[PDB]
Amino acid sequence: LIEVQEGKAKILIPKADSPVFYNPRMALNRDIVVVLLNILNPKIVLDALSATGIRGIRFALETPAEEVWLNDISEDAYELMKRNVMLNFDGELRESKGRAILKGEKTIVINHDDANRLMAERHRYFHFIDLDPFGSPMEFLDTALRSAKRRGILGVTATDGAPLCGAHPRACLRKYLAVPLRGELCHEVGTRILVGVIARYAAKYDLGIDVILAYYKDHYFRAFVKLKDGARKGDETLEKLGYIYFDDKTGKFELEQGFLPTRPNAYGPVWLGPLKDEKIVSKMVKEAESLSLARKKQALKLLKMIDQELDIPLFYDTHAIGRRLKIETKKVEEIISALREQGYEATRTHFSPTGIKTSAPYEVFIETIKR
């Protein structure tokens, strides 16, 4: 059992297969949540699957959250959670039947249980829930949508890019109830599928969603959504769903808005609405800068890219399109400059190193990239 530090938190992690899971590479993902929570200010928050407890501990130490819940089904994780919490906080941790509570400046609740059972007990209780599972979050989604306030925030992660990026089509249909698209656009389609499944599951509770921030990074998808209260809110949310058509011979895509597609070879359903709230993401860049984070340089690099990134469905991948059409292409920076000079919005995208988001028609893009 060695000690490590992440952000303002110091935790004990076992040494190697490990009894309690901890991934230092996820320090960035945790930094982004911290930044967002300092903008939204949720009071009651839940770290549904905390393992070592690092996420919830940082929520308590680095954000305005007043009541923080840490939960894990593993006995080992639970014991480690209590230890690391008391490693960062003073006081006596009162425990009773797989539940330990500390009532200090911040109220910390440590629970040993199935996330679905805990969330079912806390109906319409949390202002913010963070679902960070090992793989798919689908077995916890429906209950999280009932555990969060009707105007709460949901932070969702999916680490199984295989089905979301199209490698495992069958699994994607089973888990996400959507037809995935392979290729250069898969990182974004996977992200829009995640957001779209959250929107679809939310509808039955007469709730809609506004995406605060949804992105892809190092083989995992993240979606922060704000629940909207009302049947009409839910109707308008479903109206933002749609499908994608992809011509594998050219890289040209088409979009169809609607609950159901009306042509063959449709991919989706996917969320065709905004993948970010401009104002909030803009504020996150500033907030990240004024905060001490675990991976501050990587967090700013990602947030700045997303901040300047055009918020529009899909993009054109210079490399992939070049390979499909069998043509030579210009460099990305040369293409963006050329597109802007012609009056079209054009930016790079975090979804791909060679991707370009632009309002320009496919044909205009092709004429511009042709070298």
Ligand X SMILES: C[S@@+](CCC(N)C(=O)[O-])C[C@@H]1OC(n2cnc3c(N)ncnc32)C(O)[C@@H]1O
**Contact criterion met (CB below 8 Å) for 54 and 31:** no
Selected from 36, 39, 45, 54, the binder of ligand X by CB under 6 A is 54
269 prior amide bond cis, ω within 30: yes
Is 62 a residue that touches ligand X (CB under 6 A)? Answer: no
The answer on whether 200 is annotated among ligand-binding residues is no
**Contact criterion met (CB below 8 Å) for 366 and 319:** no
The tokens of 115 are what? 């996330």
Report the alpha-carbon distance of residue 103 to residue 366 in Å, rounded. Answer: 62
Q: By Cβ distance, which residue is nearest to ligand X?
A: 51
Selected from 55, 175, 233, 295, the binder of ligand X by CB under 6 A is 55
Q: Which stretch binds ligand X (CB under 6 A): 70-78, 168-176, 181-189, 327-335?
A: 70-78
Closer CB to ligand X, 22 or 365, in the complex:
22
Q: Which stretch binds ligand X (CB under 6 A): 34-42, 69-77, 227-235, 351-359?
A: 69-77
Is residue 97 classed exposed, middle or buried when 0-12, 13-18 and 19+ CB atoms within 10 A define those classes? Answer: exposed
The answer on whether 247 is annotated among ligand-binding residues is no
Task: Compose the 22-51 pattern: x for residues touching ligand X by CB under 6 A, - for all others.
Answer: x---x---x------------------xxx
The answer on whether 124 is annotated among ligand-binding residues is no
Closer CB to ligand X, 50 or 349, in the complex:
50
195: three-class secondary structure by DSSP: helix
Task: Compose the 88-107 pattern: x for residues touching ligand X by CB under 6 A, - for all others.
Answer: --------------------
Closer CB to ligand X, 139 or 307, in the complex:
139
Report the alpha-carbon distance of residue 369 to residue 322 in Å, rounded. Answer: 9
Strand 2-6 and strand 9-13: the pairing is antiparallel
Selected from 6, 62, 67, 72, the binder of ligand X by CB under 6 A is 72
- Collect all residues with Cβ–Cβ distance below 8 Å to 337 and sequence separation of at least 6: none
The answer on whether 130 is annotated among ligand-binding residues is no
- Least CB distance to ligand X at residue 135 (A): 8
Q: What are the Cα distances from residue 200, in Å, to 104, 194, 197, 235, 268?
A: 39, 10, 5, 10, 12
Give ∠ CA 43-275-278 in degrees, rounded to 5: 70
- Least CB distance to ligand X at residue 139 (A): 7
Task: Compose the 107-126 pattern: x for residues touching ligand X by CB under 6 A, - for all others.
Answer: -------xxx----------
The tokens of 47 are what? 């770290």
Strand 220-229 and strand 148-158: the pairing is antiparallel
Site for ligand X in 124-143 (CB under 6 A): 132-134
Closer CB to ligand X, 162 or 238, in the complex:
162
Please count the helices (runs of H) and the strands (runs of E) in the chain.
14, 17
- Least CB distance to ligand X at residue 140 (A): 7
Q: Which stretch binds ligand X (CB under 6 A): 19-27, 251-259, 290-298, 301-309?
A: 19-27
The answer on whether 30 is annotated among ligand-binding residues is yes
| 210-229 b/e (C-beta count within 10 Å ≥ 16 → b) | ebbbbbbbeebbbbbbbbbe
The site for ligand X (CB under 6 A) is made up of 21-22, 26, 30, 49-52, 54-55, 71-74, 77, 114-116, 132-134
Q: Would you list which residues are annotated within the binding site? A: 30, 55, 72, 114-115
Q: Would you list which residues are annotated within the binding site for S-adenosyl-L-methionine? A: 30, 55, 72, 114-115
